[PDB]
Design a protein around this ligand. Structure first.
Ligand SMILES: [Cl-]
Ligand SMILES: [Cl-]
Ligand SMILES: [Cl-]
Ligand SMILES: [Cl-]
Ligand SMILES: [Cl-]
Ligand SMILES: [Cl-]
Ligand SMILES: [Cl-]
Ligand SMILES: [Cl-]
Ligand SMILES: [Cl-]
Ligand SMILES: [Cl-]
Ligand SMILES: [Mg+2]
Ligand SMILES: [Mg+2]
Lengths: 368, 373, 368, 373
């Protein structure tokens, strides 16, 4: 059966920022695309693909993705494997799923057992609010809501994680102004990006409850798993975490700590195969499954195939800043219509890459 | 794409326990998938749920949509328990849809599940009915099965009356001792109490099994006492296992949280292939062993080995239970170990081969409002 | 002493919906009536009675109900036994108690040690509110309150359990409108029928607390026992569950999880014998005992005999939708007067079946 | 005061495992500090993170500001995990800055850390690769290392394939037994499973090791199962240890809370000198033993012994792992026990002596965008 011929790690300049892609070519010339979270460009993950994963995958069977990549996980375990190595593995998983869908003539979600929905609501995820004035926060939220007509809005802080409890009153004032803009009905989330102490998180949480916010993402430093779950159990507003959780077992620990809404990211860990396992874990424990996803191309497509299979979808699909950067490398990147993403039925992921644009923007990451 | 044309629920006389419960799903192109429900009291109630509740919903739907279709059905059927009867009905349909899917896509199920770590799977001889036997009878039957099967491990099961408790602890220990003496000091041996002990009785037997070097201790207390099951697991050194009478992913989670570190749900009792893969993921998330219960020689065995071929950290062998000969004549290639292993082939779907005419002669269709045959 | 001659499993068309009854005839021609929860008609439970239970009971002594049926439970354990098998057993238990009361010339509650009350307050249990507009919810509650003069009102959602957190603001608006209708004093319960995530349940719970609601039934999926009890401990409003709990041990687990008001159903599990054990368990743990019961005939009578024996009755007896369907099969089905049920002293259950109506509406479920 | 001029990331061919990962930091006055990253798959990814991410930030900054500089970098690098690759990169830079600091201030690192309890540190012979050996081969290699090193303790490590589980428990116990027989009843012996067992398998091996009087039992289950690791630690009597695959102070806290009472983080995998001192404090706060993992004969060894010289309640010896001979010729004074001890000298900084020309001939610089050599 179908063998892997070539595995390429590609650093790609996006928009008119760099992303990190894996292109896997089968012996029949078919191609699958994967993506690794582009943290500091994703260069370290791309190096791990090129040096450590690619030589093993070449000549192996496309359909054996789970055995191949779980063997690789164990080979790479002493690289963490959190972060760099899990993202490298996730990218390879997504690419092998893309190839698999093409080989079998099916969209990935059909191979995953079917979709509950092929029109998926979005939420506008608006970052960089720590640095903005109140008027600037309101201006940007208004702009994106007008353009995207989302089912929900999330305002994210993206502050400096060496600092803590920097401007709680200002943060609350911004949350209040956003509530006044969007009206009493609006579904609004607040993402602290790890900005608070336990006590600071409680204080902000109570203010967000007074403002009717729906969820409160990453209130404390992600490394404090006990504190994350404690804050989750102490508050009424739904506390969420998981975007910086990179293994199934650490996700289990996060749930056991008290967190009831988890948000692992398909290009940071797991890929399609791992994210389905994470969904199963969440269903076993009665926790909401609301993936983190900020990339407009390959990662977005992997995310929506997985989310189309989720029975109890409780929050919309993330649409983060500067999603326009999906063009021109991709012909059909994330682009909401009537506040939804329309998942199609092309084989594999169904993402379409512009060959000439990619070539002009791509740097291959090779062994030394 | 490929639509479901017909769903049949079949009660089938097997071999020379005497009847099994199968689901045959026929697609619009005439291809057929086979599933199996645990044949508890014949599996007749499960077959009735298939015929009345599930079949009318699946007919006309897409084969590939199995997860959405069957999770929708689970929610329609939730007030039937759904533990036991309904989960086995759902499991049978899942297995049949996977068989159809493999045939549609031209791949064995393990390839579709992401690859096999192994296609030769070690077996263990699972030998039941020891409560009723004398010591010499236990030894004789174990020796017989071991000679025939060359297994990687042996499990002796009690299958006593569950209205009784702590019936004959000294005799049970004597049987365990005699089996150790037969098999030698190296042999991997498990003991399945089939829910026969109190917590105190279970501790007492557990310590005796530890002295005899037994490897695992299955279902020591009544399955309904989940707290007690996990307590006994944490109090003993020998690995306590349970899960064969656990029917949902959430109840499996509860069993793990109680303290159980080896879980044994059954692919024809709950979940089917799709659900068993989820259970495997849950076990991996929690660091517990995954050692499915499986006692049927045909469809259920094949589903079980496709799933187990995908398990990275396989720690115990595949179950081979009593009277596996009954796989024939309904099936042409039922479970039959070679050099102590099951050889998993590469035929599309399950790869199980049914003798159509034998099946026809032995099958009673369970229909809306009756039995036919 | 008195032997069982015949056990019949009967599917019966009700009103001018199908129910599931067990008729047991003793050797002297006396008859006892039982009922199994009519889930999808209760046909599977009726089949279990006919195939698995009836042949064992025939020729056995009526008075040996507990030994006979606990032996049957163990014979049937691998059928779950949750749901189908426990309902089949419950129906047989109720029928044997009816026969026992007739044989001994006593109403069942006297055999159970006496009644604290023979006039039992009701609550109007009004379902199908997920699908209604606010005005339709208010209209139906008003209609039933006018007719039934209940001691309390419960509004139930009965939504699609494949969906989650569908319309929290609308749900709260309906709860608010019902509070405004019934006034500040009114005792009102809200039954989510498993419609929320943990976080959604907390959000609705706080709104119900603001509206002075008395209890909050089945907020999360019943399978998430840990989450059910967590929600119960996190909120102030009394969270209740148990209607989808089918064994004494699983009821123990539900209590240990944190639930302080339990609602097992006499025709879903246990029958009279099992429900008395459940009441004992609740008393041991200091939890309220408020049975789920939605059937107007046999199940209602079994329920009120048991509830007449409950010392610390804290909530009224459930009176669910379309209770008029008790006629014409029964001559004296559930029918409140001055907001109460009047329990009489006829031997056994005291339910009166119209022979000709039953015969015209009954289909016997037989072995194949 | 003294500014950092240059940060170099070097992949170095060692001895005759074959390559190591070093960081050389040069101050504006020409003084040099040496650090090391755990050379997992050569440490190349860590070296790339040093070259691309850390080096440009450190160049021009004050040597003495190491903690603020590297904690700022940890936060810049947090989305790289930072477990494993990034923490080892940070550890290497910390060690190099401490070496520079000691040279600047004219003091050995242990003096700067508040004094040494001891400058002669007992060693233990850490002997790997026993999964693959026969019993006689295990005995032969242990006898060889013991004759050469005269250690205060011996640890036998398995280093098996982590995709496999409970592979050969009887054989493992036989090897442990043979080693006890070789070394005598008094000998302090540890057993390192390298993550080879299930919870049940770990309990079974643990009891056998207790019967053989073993002193500690390292990494019995997969490291990712933190709950299971601590559970096994609390269930057994033999001291269960872990931490070598734990990379943050908070994850070390979680490992302790799970039940582990002997922790073994590695100075070149995480923290460096600064972080290892914090880990020691955490262990002291919780009453757990602190017994670092360390397998490198040069820079990492020297960092390790400076820190361990400061540990009041030292309970186990310093690790001396396989092929320590590979310290030469790159280093002039790599780890080499004398009368079963390591002699810590008083040279400023680490006190490690590098052969410049050997280093040059064996070093490939890892730079932004490539390998050079
Ligand atoms: Cl597939
Ligand atoms: Cl914490
Ligand atoms: Cl996180
Ligand atoms: Cl229990
Ligand atoms: Cl079980
Ligand atoms: Cl739960
Ligand atoms: Cl319930
Ligand atoms: Cl100092
Ligand atoms: Cl764990
Ligand atoms: Cl570790
Ligand atoms: Mg952790
Ligand atoms: Mg349970």
């Amino acid at each position: 059966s179908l063998k892997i011929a070539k595995v390429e790690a590609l650093s790609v300049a996006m928009g008119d920022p760099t992303s990190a892609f894996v292109r896997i070519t089968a012996e029949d010339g078919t191609v699958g695309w994967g993506e690794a979270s582009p943290m500091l460009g994703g260069i370290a993950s791309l190096g791990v693909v090129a040096r450590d994963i690619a030589p093993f995958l070449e000549g192996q069977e496309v359909l054996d993705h789970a055995v191949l990549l779980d063997r690789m996980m164990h080979r790479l375990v002493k690289l963490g494997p959190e972060g760099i190595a899990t993202a490298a593995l996730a990218a390879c998983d997504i690419a092998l799923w893309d190839l698999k869908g093409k080989l079998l003539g099916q969209p990935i979600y059909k191979l995953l057992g079917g979709a509950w929905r092929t029109r998926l609501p979005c939420y506008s995820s608006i970052g960089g609010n720590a640095a903005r004035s109140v008027d600037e926060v309101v201006r940007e939220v208004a702009r994106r809501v007008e353009a995207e007509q989302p089912a929900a809005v999330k305002i994210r802080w993206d502050g400096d994680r060496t600092r803590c409890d920097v401007d709680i009153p200002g943060d609350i004032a911004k949350a209040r102004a956003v509530r006044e803009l969007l009206g009493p009905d609006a579904v609004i989330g607040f993402d602290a990006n790890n900005g608070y102490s336990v006590g600071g998180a409680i204080r902000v949480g109570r203010a967000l409850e007074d403002l009717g916010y729906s969820w409160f993402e990453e209130p404390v430093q992600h490394y404090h798993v006990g504190a994350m779950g404690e804050v989750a159990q102490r508050l009424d507003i739904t506390v969420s975490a998981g975007e910086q959780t990179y293994t199934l077992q650490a996700l289990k620990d996060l749930i056991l700590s008290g967190v009831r809404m988890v948000q692992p990211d398909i290009v940071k860990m797991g890929g399609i195969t791992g994210m389905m396992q994470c969904a199963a874990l969440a269903h076993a424990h009665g926790v909401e499954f609301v993936p983190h996803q900020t990339q407009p191309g390959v990662g977005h497509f992997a995310n929506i195939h997985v989310l189309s299979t989720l029975m109890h979808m409780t929050k919309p699909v993330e649409l983060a800043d500067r999603w326009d950067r999906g063009r021109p490398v991709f012909r059909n990147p994330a682009e909401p219509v009537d506040g939804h993403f329309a998942l199609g039925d092309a084989p594999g992921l169904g993402i379409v890459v512009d060959e000439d644009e990619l070539a002009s923007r791509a740097t291959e990451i090779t062994v030394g």
